[PDB]
Amino acid sequence: STLFDEEYEFQLLLAEAKLYESLNQLQQDLENLLAPFQSVKETEQNWKLRQSNIIELDNIISGNIPKDNPEEFVTVIKEVQLIELISRATSSLRTTLSLTALLFLKRLIHILNDQLPLSILDQIFVIFKNLLSSTKKISSQTAFHCLITLIIDINHFHNKLFQLSFLLINEKTVTPRFCSAILLRSFLIKFNDSNLSLSKLENNIIYIEEWLKKGISDSQTTVREAMRLTFWYFYKCYPTNAKRLLSSSFSPQLKKATELAIPAHL
DSSP states (O other): OOSSOHHHHHHHHHHHTOOOOOHHHHHHHHHHHHGGGSSSOOOTTTHHHHHHHHHHHHHHHTSHHHHHOHHHHHHHHHHTTHHHHHHHHHTOSSHHHHHHHHHHHHHHHHHHGGGSOHHHHHHHHHHHHHHTTOSOHHHHHHHHHHHHHHHHHOOSOOHHHHHHHHHGGGOSSHHHHHHHHHHHHHHHHHHSHHHHHOOOSGGGHHHHHHHHHHHHTOSSHHHHHHHHHHHHHHHHHOHHHHHHHHHHTSOHHHHHHHHTTOOTTO
């Protein structure tokens, strides 16, 4: 079997983050739906049309062409600059429009998943991660959920996405740092040598160790608690390295607290 039971672990991760006749005709329809997004300025006069048009775009990605021909569909959404234009709505101060756009991107990730080039996954990850720092609670929490779902949906290991996740540990507001402890856990679950077969992480252990040390000594109690639990996932993947952190790198304070955070199934 695999080191981790992904079916079980994913349900836990998600609980941390509660919520055409031709391709040319498709492209023309996309260009017409994106027209109200072409202006930088959201106005009283275009925000409802932007929201309504995202609903129609969501209907389009549920269609047969993205299911049957994701590769050429990806070429189309690149050419019409779908992600950049959708980012004008994720940045809206209007809650319903920003949330509608975030859920659209979540559904796009789900449906196209590993058919998306890294450049587009990177684009979407940055939109999500930056909203983790929103002072608006429903925004950061929705972005958190979308990021966890992204990691579950994307089955290829990308160093770029691991580094974007890692560097959240340096953000000043608590939520990205807390999210980062869950993201690290997700990477350990899915992409350790055992789970991946059914090395990606070996060369990233230096970052993992810094990531753990920072979170476990975080000023915020929720980040410390989350990172102490993630430490035991690291211990399950690389016990020699984790033991060295526990004895050769932690104070007796953080050591005892970390030892009391073992989950009952690991």
